[PDB]
Amino acid sequence: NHVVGRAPEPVVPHEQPQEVLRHFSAEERAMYEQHVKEQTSRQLGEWERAM
Amino acid sequence: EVVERDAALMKKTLSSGRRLRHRVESSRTHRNAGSLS
Amino acid sequence: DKAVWESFYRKTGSLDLDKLAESIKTALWDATRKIRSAKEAALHRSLSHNTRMRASADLKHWYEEDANTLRPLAFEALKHEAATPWMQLVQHGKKEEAAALLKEFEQKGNREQPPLASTLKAEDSNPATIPIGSVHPLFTPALVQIEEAGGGSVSNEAVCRAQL
Amino acid sequence: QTAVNSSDNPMLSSVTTAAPAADLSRTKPHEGTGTSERDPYIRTLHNQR
Amino acid sequence: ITSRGQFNPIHNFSYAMERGVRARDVKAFEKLITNPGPLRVAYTPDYLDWLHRCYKAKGTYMDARAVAEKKFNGAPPPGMFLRPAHSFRRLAGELKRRRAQSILDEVARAQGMLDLFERQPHFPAIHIDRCSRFHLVELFKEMVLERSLDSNMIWEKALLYRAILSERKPSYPTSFHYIFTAVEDTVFAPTIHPLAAKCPTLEAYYYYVYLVKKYYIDNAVEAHVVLRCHREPNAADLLFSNPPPKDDTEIMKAVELLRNADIQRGPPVLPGAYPPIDMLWRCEENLPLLKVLLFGEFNLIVSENPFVKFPSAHGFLTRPYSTDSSMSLANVMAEKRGHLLPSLPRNTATSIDARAQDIRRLQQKHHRDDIVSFQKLLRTPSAFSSYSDWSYFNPRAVRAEERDRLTRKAVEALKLYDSATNDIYRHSFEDVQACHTQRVTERDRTMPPYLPTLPHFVAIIKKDPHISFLLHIGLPDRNSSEEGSAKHKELEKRIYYLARALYHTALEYHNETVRRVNRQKVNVAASLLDNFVEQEWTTILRDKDTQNDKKQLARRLGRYMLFANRSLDDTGFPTDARADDYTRWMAPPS
Amino acid sequence: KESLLPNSSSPFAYVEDYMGTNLVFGSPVHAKESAAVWATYFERRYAS
Amino acid sequence: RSAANLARAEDLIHAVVTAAAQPFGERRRAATRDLHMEFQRLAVPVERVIVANPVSALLESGADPDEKPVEGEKVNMWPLGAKRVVLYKWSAPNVEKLKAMESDASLTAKRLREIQELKRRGFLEVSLWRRVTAQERKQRNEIVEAKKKQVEEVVRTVPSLAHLHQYATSLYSRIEERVAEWEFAVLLDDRVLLNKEESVELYLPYRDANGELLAQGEYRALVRAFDLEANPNLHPAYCSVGYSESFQVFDALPQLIAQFFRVTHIPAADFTPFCAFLRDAGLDVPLRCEFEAGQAVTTDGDVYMDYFLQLLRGEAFHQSHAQAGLTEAQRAIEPLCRAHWVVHHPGADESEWATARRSVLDHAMQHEREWWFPNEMLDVKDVVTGSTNGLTPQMYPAAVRYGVELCTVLTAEGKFVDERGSGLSARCVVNGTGAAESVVFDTANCNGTNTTSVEDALRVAHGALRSAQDRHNTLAAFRLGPLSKQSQVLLFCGVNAYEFGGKYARTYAYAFEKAKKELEATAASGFMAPSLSHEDTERLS
Amino acid sequence: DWASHMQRELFGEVDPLGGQAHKDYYRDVTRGYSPQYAPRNFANGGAVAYPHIQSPYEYEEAAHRRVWLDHDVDRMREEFTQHRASLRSLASAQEREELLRSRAAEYQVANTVHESESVHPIQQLYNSGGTSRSALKQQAVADRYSIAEQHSPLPLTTGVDRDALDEAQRTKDRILNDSFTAENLLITHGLREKEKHDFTILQRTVRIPFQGYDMDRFLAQQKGTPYGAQQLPPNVVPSSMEEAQRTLRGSSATATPLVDAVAQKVYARNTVVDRPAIGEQLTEQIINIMRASRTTAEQQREEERAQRFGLGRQGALVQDGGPDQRTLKKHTNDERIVDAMLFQQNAYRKTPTDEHWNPYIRRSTENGVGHLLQNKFDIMRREDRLSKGEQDL
């Protein structure tokens, strides 16, 4: 009942634990964020277009 | 003998004594300046 | 084929210069890519026929020298191309013909062709001809002393002296 | 997923705590270092088609 | 090179000692330390002692070096021998040492000077008695003016210093007396007019007296805090002081008393506008006020934490504590998640709200203890060091970057000094005779031509047909259009990331823990690059035949091999090893 | 600037032995210094 | 002995090649004199140029702020370490626009911004030219001629150098940038932004930078004016020039030092009235300089006069505006960029370099930074000891590779303008591959008539690709050059470390011949190699 | 609006926190002793949220990026001087604020703060408890360097020197060599074979796991994917502030290169030491401490390696029964065993391909696939097939 129109929850390729992320430099963490942002946006948008 | 000499030199880094420092008197309004007398 | 291609770029039309630029850029890239492929090809033929290097089992032989690494190097073009015929002769280690050309120099005192096709002819592709000084460029200044004072070929005398 | 660690049970008293798996190591096609299911002590799946 | 609470020399002893001028008695040394020129740097006894000892040691050093060189007419490392003087290698080495040591000297002194005008404790007082308009104006324009964003705050700073000096007069030491000449000599614009545009009003001055009396300001430090918080809408709240502020009846009464008592010698609102800044520095009339201002900055600075006295202003002046809180979590997470996802099942919602509470509790619990433990941990180079971490607040504290530049310069100089060792000194002859017995051999005995180096990898990932095509041809031209330069920047940046990742993997390849993590950095980087390439490639093909054009050339290249699924080892080349082995080596951490 | 070192671009101008010695094309000071170095060395060698 | 001969050769080669470059310089300078003399007929003159005493900002007790009445009439002489104010009148449109917009100017962030951009739009360059006695001119003519003689003898003795001459001339004519009494002394200001006041305080230093001291004698101040609309990319020919009247330059210290003390030490009472005394003679003693001169001191509290002088006379506490405009970083790479710039401008004067200095170094530190910046792998800290100390035989081929990949990946840029008169011009950006990352035509310069055949656009792009590939080759020579030269000393004189030196040389040669012979049989066997095991062979011999 | 505040601090020649110790700001070395924001995360629990540098090469690189960015930080300084002169010129609050707003937009100050983008409720939790947008913007402090980083070329050069790279190669070599030696020694004592056997013993006990009646559903629910199947991570009890801070700083202390470590320590000690010095005597003292440090560390590594593999002669060299005498104890490394082991591997061996006259040895894939790739064609094919995620032929 709850889930009917909704998108699948975005699945980000090579998503990281907190314990690996703790070793990313400030710049590499910015990059990680860029990656997650882009995957999430791409997928959710793809679902919009699909539906 | 070389390596002996350098271990002998890294012994001298822990042989550091401290020289006695000299506290001054804290005030609320300024800093006190002592000079050698 | 100006007949065919001219109106593609317009010309009365005014030139694109955008289309024209992209196509120049692309053409150049194509040429360069042919060069690089030729280099790598040479490397490949060598590796596949060389059994001693095959004996040590190394995948790394195939990647340790690639188009970037092999010669001719592009950023070295000038000093090799802008060079006089004499200079090119000595650069490629032909001391005989360079000395000859030098004596004749003293005593008597858009084109299509690579500037080196003058000095380097067919017969200098034979690996038999390549002087030992020139063989391994990395070490050239050291391997030059094994060589004869005038001749490209190694001098028994010098090497025996050194050993003795 | 089993540890080759030593057990206090009487049947397992022969079992000795294993050194950790070797780091960059090239195995024989029928063995693995035994870390995960993806990498068993004994590779059961054939490598053919 | 500097760390917290380190002493640095501001004196150049070397120049005079090379001329042969040396001191013996302590009186001689005090005579060596006193600037004739206008400025007077006082010292703590401690710093003075340290400096003295250093001086003596430098005497002994230059002495023994000179005596050694008179006997021979430095002293080698243990297994080494001195090359001859007038040998190229030794001349070069010694030169290198001369230069490196001049650099290290200059740096030492520069950091000393930073300490001096940052008002570090061992330089307790800078005295200006001997300065003339030039020195004062210059000191002002280098120290006060340049730094300040706001013009109008400078005047305030001045009057407030005048008020503090005038109110605290008994407790100041004798060496300060001269400055009071400048305080009684201050010229004010008549009450509401030729000086109205030149100088400030007396009313203003009494406002600031009100502030010194009401908040008990003893310092340039609390001055700083008060002056930043007082014009703001929350003023009563920010500046509310731990010993509570006096009630305005008594204060305004004492201000009436001062105003009146000073008339017979010849809730107040925050004051108005003041004359444009330049007047202060360029009118003779303001010259005493200016003087006070300088004296206010270079002295009147004391260690004490102003945030013991103004505990509510700590959040405003410097950043607030994260453990201190000035909807439900579930609703925030709903807002980020967007309307396109199912709302959180209300189990997980409730569960997450529970965590949010438990975390609130952890914060409240650990707020004090973390602070305490932190300062205690700093008081104990060591893991904890800095240019400035001091317990006390310093409004003139130097920017971290000025100090770091010096430090870096000094470390270059050190590495330079260390180089020259192998130029000046040499190994035993027969040791190198021996050494030349094992020749360098190309194949084995020489390091391999592919080491980890950033351009090696950048080259490797730019050598791919698809990416080489995308760089040169594929993207719209970088100079021609905006999309061109944008796409170009991003492609280049992504290559760069993947290159840095491969590089740091290659360096640490031998140690497993670090390698698996660095490997995850490679995965993220490569994934980013692959998505960019894939996208731009599709764009090339879709975008709207003719022989040898862009699209044909692209379709000739074939399928794009993803950088993610590439298996490259330490040297940046594909592996020798079986896929199952390589996969295991690079597997994620647990 | 004034220093004692040959003024030339080529590094080949600054080449000497490992022992800091040049008995060819060295300045007269260098030459005496270096012949003295080798003299001392061989004196000790043939002594022992 | 052979190392000595190598060095000797490189010295000669350097002489010969330089002597080949000078005439290019004369012709370039001539063409630029010409082009400039044309352009200045049509452009906005810089009419009044006057050197004057700087006017104190300080006011007396009864004065009021606003006037700015005194510019000073003029000045007969400019002391060495002193500030003077040069006044210019440049009536160019943007300057007018500035005077108007500022005289209208209680303040808005917007208008502040507008004013600052309007200031950045044009700029002035101020320099000091010195006169020359016929005596000095004859001494220089004499020295130049003696050098030319030495070069002619050298070339005569050793034929191959006479050949290298023709080489260098033919290279310069290709590499070079095509262009279609008083001697320069100092650059006081690289970029003076536009003012409503039309004046600059300039500090003259004690030292021009090649590091030399400044002479005495007559100087006039030259002022160049550039506006970035009429002359983007800042060609040196297009600009507006005017000169001040002559004045006298000298170093005043030894007079004033003599006048105040009537001098190795200074007693410490006098120090502060001494510095005051100096500032009244016009000299600039900064505050810090006083302060440090005072911090190195005799037993008696004295100031060493030579330490004080050394501080006054050097770049530490005050600089030419021209040198303050540059970063620490830029000043560190400057001799490299200058060397390179001079390869492409064969025979440049210090005047020319002075003009182009800012623009070149900004370009370098922006677009070129990878080429110019010091590179711990490639770079050489020292020439004498580089072969021995920094570079190991074990690290050598790695470092060579590093150079090669770096150049492969980096990028160079080049320009070409059409010689046949349409303003068609191309820019190119080029890899270490020879490939072109970018090619662009610019129709801006050329008129609306166009009518340029595809042929001519092709010729233009050809020329641009050329100049670009050449820039890239030259940059690579400078990036990889030092390390490769020291590599040469390592391998040539350090043979006996290697397997091709000494007793093992003979083995290498042997291996070499076998390889050759072996290649032959592989070519005979159809490029399938014989057996390693030599199972293939007819005879046991 | 927080952005204008940050910009305000960037313009100032004064340190933003006034040099004072603040528990939430790590003054980091790597970052040039600059006050970076590093709160404790109580959702992860006890852990200071901030980068932990894991190698010296990371340090050396970051230091280099600072040197590279120098020129830009300098142009920026020169530009800031102009800016805050303009700020002095402006007499009204609101206009000043307009200037700061527009200029903070231009320098992209806001773009320095990196917020977690994850839509997943759990990652949401981890970041958003302690470190959130609301918090991160309010708490962030920008150095000039982090601003120059954004408008600037990217360096192709790590700060690593020729010699530093020499030592890197040597270190990697040495450690790899000893690890391979150690592993072969475990195979030789047959402890690996034992480990396999014992695994087989442990199998006796185990059940086959319940995989569910609907196996898809089951697997998925184990992973927490289906709807309402989300579990929260187990709450961890936070560690004392000293512990967390010591982890964070110990990390970057380990990573400090020799020169910096020594130099910092020498100067800092020179203040308190009994016989202090300035000038060249100090420099000397540093160089000596450094050279001695290298030598001592070398010698210590050799002794360690000796203890690990049991290298070195046993007892007296001149024993009656010959020099040779040695004793081997069960599962214990010894010099003799190491060298016998290598002897077995390569005894008269001329090349690794020596035994490849034998077809069944030649196509063994044990050592890797590298001897079986002969023409380029096949190599490329392998590359392709591997990238597609299929098997190598």
SS (H, E, C) chain H: CHHHHHHHHHHCCECCCCCCCCCCEEEECCCCCEEEECCEECCCCCEECCCCCCCHHHHHHHHHHHHHHHHHHHHHHHHHHHHHHHHHHCCCHHHHHHHHHHHHHHCCCHHHCCCCCCCCHHHHHHHHHHCCHHHHHHHCCCCHHHHHCCCCCCCCCCCCCHHHHHHHHHHHHHHHHHHHHHHHHHHHCCHHHHHHHHHHHHHCCCCCCCCCCCHHHHHHHHHCCCCCCCCCCCCCCCCCHHHHHHHHHHHHHHCCCHHHHHHHHHHHHHHHECCCCCCHHHHHHHHHHHHHHHHHHHHHHHHHHHHHHCCCCCCCCCCCCCCCCCCCCCCCCCHHHHHHHHHHHCCCCCCCCCCCCCHHHHCCCCCCCCCCCCCHHHHHHHHHHHHCCCCCC
Question: Measuring CA to CA, how many Å separate G526 from each of C38, G520, G529, H126, H181?
Answer: 21, 10, 8, 68, 44
Which of A9, A28, A35 is the closest to E527 by Cβ?
A35
3-state helix, strand, coil in chain B (%, to 5): 25, 5, 70
CA distance E414 to E407: 10
Contact pairs from chain D to chain E, CB under 8 Å: 21
Burial annotation G74-88 (CB, 10 A radius, 16+ → b, else e) = ebeebbbbbbbbbbb
C59 has a chain H CB within 8 A of its CB: yes
Closest CA to E111 of E420, E392, E411: E411
Tokens of G97: 């626009």
Neighbouring CB atoms inside 10 A of E263's CB total: 9
Is chain H adjacent to chain B, meaning 3+ CB pairs within 8 angstroms? yes
Q: φ and ψ at E410, to 5 degrees?
A: -70, -35
Closest CA to G188 of G220, G218, G158, G232: G220
Answer whether E508's CB lies under 8 Å from A23's CB.
no
Q: How far apart are the first and last CA of chain F?
A: 46
CA distance F20 to F38: 10
Q: φ and ψ at E187, to 5 degrees?
A: -110, 125
Residues 6+ apart with CB under 8 A from G205: G80, G81, G186, G214, G315, G318, G319, G320
Q: Which residues of H touch C62 (CB under 8 A)?
A: 373, 376, 379
Closest CA to G531 of H237, E470, H357, E234: H357
The 8-class DSSP code of residue E84 comes to P
CA distance E99 to E498: 40
Q: Say if residue H231 is exposed, middle or buried (CB neighbours under 10 Å; 0-12, 13-18, 19+).
A: exposed
CA distance E74 to E91: 13
> What value, to the nearest 5°, has the Cα angle with vertex E279 and ends E276 and E280?
105
Element (H, E) at G123: strand G122-131
Chain F, 2 to 21: residues with Cβ < 8 Å from chain E are 3-5, 14-16, 18-21
Closest CA to H86 of G324, G194, G107: G107
Tokens of H310: 């049991």
Closest CA to H103 of H117, H83, H118: H83
Q: Coil, strand or helix: which one is E426? A: strand
Q: How far apart are the first and last CA of chain G?
A: 45
Question: Measuring CA to CA, how many Å separate E261 from each of C25, E33, E249, E251, E254?
Answer: 88, 44, 18, 15, 10
A24 has a chain H CB within 8 A of its CB: yes
Element (H, E) at G427: strand G425-430
G294 has a chain E CB within 8 A of its CB: yes
Tokens 């592009």 appear where?
Answer: C74
Cα torsion H41, H44, H48, H49 to 10°: value is -80
Please report the sign of the dihedral spanned by the C-alpha atoms of residue G333, residue G334, residue G337, residue G342. negative
Length of chain E: 590
Tokens 């002022």 appear where?
Answer: G223
CA distance G440 to E480: 7
| Cis upstream peptide for C72 (omega within 30°) | yes
Amino acid G167 reads: Y
Strands G247-250 and G77-79: parallel
Question: Measuring CA to CA, how many Å separate H99 from each of E144, G109, H90, H193?
Answer: 22, 6, 9, 74
Q: Which residues of G touch H161 (CB under 8 A)?
A: 376-377
Answer whether G233's CB lies under 8 Å from G442's CB.
no
Element (H, E) at E550: helix E550-557
Is chain D adjacent to chain H, meaning 3+ CB pairs within 8 angstroms? yes
Tokens of E305: 């934490």
Tokens of D40: 């068993």
Q: Across-strand partners of G187?
A: G127
Q: Which residues of E touch B6 (CB under 8 A)?
A: 78
Q: Say if residue H381 is exposed, middle or buried (CB neighbours under 10 Å; 0-12, 13-18, 19+).
A: middle
Q: Which residues of C touch G433 (CB under 8 A)?
A: 32, 36, 67, 74
Biggest CA-to-CA distance, chain C:
82
Element (H, E) at E251: helix E248-263
Q: Which residues of C touch E480 (CB under 8 A)?
A: 18, 21
Length of chain B: 37
Tokens 């057996």 appear where?
Answer: G531
Element (H, E) at G222: strand G217-227
CA distance C86 to C105: 9
Length of chain A: 51
The 8-class DSSP code of residue E284 comes to G
Tokens of G1: 């002995």
Q: Across-strand partners of G241?
A: G224
CA distance E210 to E204: 10
Q: Which residues of A touch H58 (CB under 8 A)?
A: 25
Residues 6+ apart with CB under 8 A from D10: none
Answer whether H147's CB lies under 8 Å from H79's CB.
no
3-state helix, strand, coil in chain D (%, to 5): 0, 5, 95
Closest CA to C79 of G435, G174, G406: G174
Experimental technique behind these coordinates: cryo-EM
Q: Coil, strand or helix: which one is G406? A: helix
Question: Measuring CA to CA, how many Å separate E325 from each of E238, E313, F10, H135?
Answer: 16, 15, 69, 10
Alpha helices in E88-176 (DSSP H): 88-117, 133-139, 152-167
Neighbouring CB atoms inside 10 A of E180's CB total: 15
CA distance G288 to E139: 9
Closest CA to E89 of G11, F5, G494: F5
CA distance G485 to G501: 20
With both helix axes pointing from N to C terminus, report the angle between G454-493 and C18-49 in degrees, rounded to the nearest 10: 40
> What value, to the nearest 5°, has the Cα angle with vertex G146 and ends G144 and G148?
70
Element (H, E) at C134: helix C132-135
Biggest CA-to-CA distance, chain F:
46
CA distance E146 to H84: 8
Tokens of E425: 């000194």
Closest CA to B31 of E220, E400, A19, G165: E220
Q: Coil, strand or helix: which one is E74? A: coil
CA distance G484 to G386: 11
Question: Measuring CA to CA, how many Å separate C148 from each of C90, G450, G490, G505, H180?
Answer: 14, 62, 21, 13, 48
Tokens 């909807």 appear where?
Answer: E327
H352 has a chain C CB within 8 A of its CB: yes
CA distance G91 to G228: 15
Answer whether E501's CB lies under 8 Å from E511's CB.
no
Which of C50, C142, C160 is the closest to G498 by Cβ?
C142
Burial annotation G439-468 (CB, 10 A radius, 16+ → b, else e) = bbbbbeebeeeeebebebbebbbebbbebb
Biggest CA-to-CA distance, chain B:
59
Question: Measuring CA to CA, how many Å separate G39 from each of E407, G32, G236, G238, G417?
Answer: 51, 10, 11, 6, 19
CA distance E58 to B16: 18
Q: Which residues of D touch E584 (CB under 8 A)?
A: 32-33, 35, 38-39
Closest CA to G122 of G235, G227, G192: G227
C42 has a chain G CB within 8 A of its CB: no
Contact pairs from chain G to chain H, CB under 8 Å: 69
Q: φ and ψ at C132, to 5 degrees?
A: -65, -30
CA distance E249 to E267: 9
Q: φ and ψ at G185, to 5 degrees?
A: -125, -65
Tokens of F19: 């022992």
Tokens 């080669």 appear where?
Answer: G13
CA distance E426 to E404: 35
Q: How far apart are the first and last CA of chain B?
A: 48
Question: Measuring CA to CA, how many Å separate E304 from each of E147, E297, G120, H15?
Answer: 23, 15, 47, 17
Closest CA to E200 of E189, E185, E191: E189
Q: Across-strand partners of G192?
A: G124
CA G438 to chain centre: 27
D15 has a chain H CB within 8 A of its CB: yes
Closest CA to H10 of H100, H138, H133: H100
Question: Measuring CA to CA, how many Å separate G43 from each of G124, G241, G244?
Answer: 15, 10, 19
Q: Which residues of E touch H176 (CB under 8 A)?
A: 510
Answer whether B31's CB lies under 8 Å from E124's CB.
yes
Neighbouring CB atoms inside 10 A of G21's CB total: 19
Instruction: Please enumerate residues of E whose Cβ is less than 8 A from a Cβ of F.
Output: 83-92, 95, 426, 429, 432
Residues 6+ apart with CB under 8 A from G528: C49, G522
Contact pairs from chain C to chain E, CB under 8 Å: 41
Answer whether G204's CB lies under 8 Å from G249's CB.
yes
**Closest residue in chain H to residue G333, using alpha carbons only:** H71
